[PDB]
Amino acid sequence: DSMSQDLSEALKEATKEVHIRAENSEFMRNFQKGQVSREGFKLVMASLYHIYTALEEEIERNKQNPVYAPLYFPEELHRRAALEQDMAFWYGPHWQEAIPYTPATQHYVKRLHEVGGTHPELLVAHAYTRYLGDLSGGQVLKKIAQKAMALPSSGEGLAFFTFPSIDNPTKFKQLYRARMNTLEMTPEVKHRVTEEAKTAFLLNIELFEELQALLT
């Protein structure tokens, strides 16, 4: 197998194909072209709320585990608190009972717990997939959402897309990739981590196809 490369390199080469598929999914495609409504935006953000909540809960559970510990950046990355602000903004005071919890979202959340509870050595695959993506297309989707729905530059309703503790996401991404290469990595784990990364992308693709359908 390809163990002659660093985990960050293996992950990038392993997910580049499905990434193109995920990037050109119907829901994302629309969002990219400015075509994004309040109804849909609220659907995906509520979904991300449940997802990041599960991911970050598993991160806390395994924060001391060396298979993940070097990547424990709650202050800089975690989105749960940010998404809670966003839910209050979009759904109001009682968002805990108003926000949806779709099947595709539940599916994603279920795999997150399985990994965090049973296969924690794979958890890095899920943080990698979501966090780095946020740091890459984060400012892009944000500027689009603002132009489309008239969200003020002050950021209310888009806290999720804002990283106040990260000055340069590009530099941080570089740090995160390098830190990923310091994890205990056997040919067995690296092999499985890259596969789980694909699964994460697929889970994201399945969420989008589901939301797109709900909207149409």
**Does the annotation list 177 as a binding residue?**
yes
One of 40, 116, 133, 157 touching Fe ion (CB under 5 A): 133
Separation in Å, CA 89 to CA 46, 139, 157, 160, 195: 11, 19, 6, 12, 36
One of 128, 160, 163, 172 touching ligand BLA (CB under 6 A): 128
By the rule CB under 5 A, 96 interacts with Fe ion: no
Which residues, 6 or more positions from 60, have their beta carbon under 8 angstroms from its beta carbon?
74
Interface stretch with ligand BLA, choices 62-70, 74-82, 97-105, 132-140 (CB under 6 A): 132-140
| Residues 108 and 209: beta-carbon distance below 8 Å | no
- Measured CA to CA, the distance from residue 65 to residue 13 in angstroms comes to 26
**Does the annotation list 126 as a binding residue?**
no
| 194 interface partner picked from ligand BLA, Fe ion, none, CB below 5 to 8 A per type | none
Other beta carbons less than 10 A from residue 29's beta carbon: 13
One of 204, 207, 210, 212 touching ligand BLA (CB under 6 A): 204
Interface stretch with ligand BLA, choices 46-54, 87-95, 130-138, 142-150 (CB under 6 A): 130-138
**Does the annotation list 190 as a binding residue?**
no
Indicate the DSSP class of residue 167: S
- Measured CA to CA, the distance from residue 212 to residue 207 in angstroms comes to 9
Binding residues for heme b: 12, 19, 128, 177
- Give the binding site for ligand BLA (CB under 6 A): 8, 11-12, 19, 22-23, 28, 128-129, 132-133, 136-137, 140, 201, 204
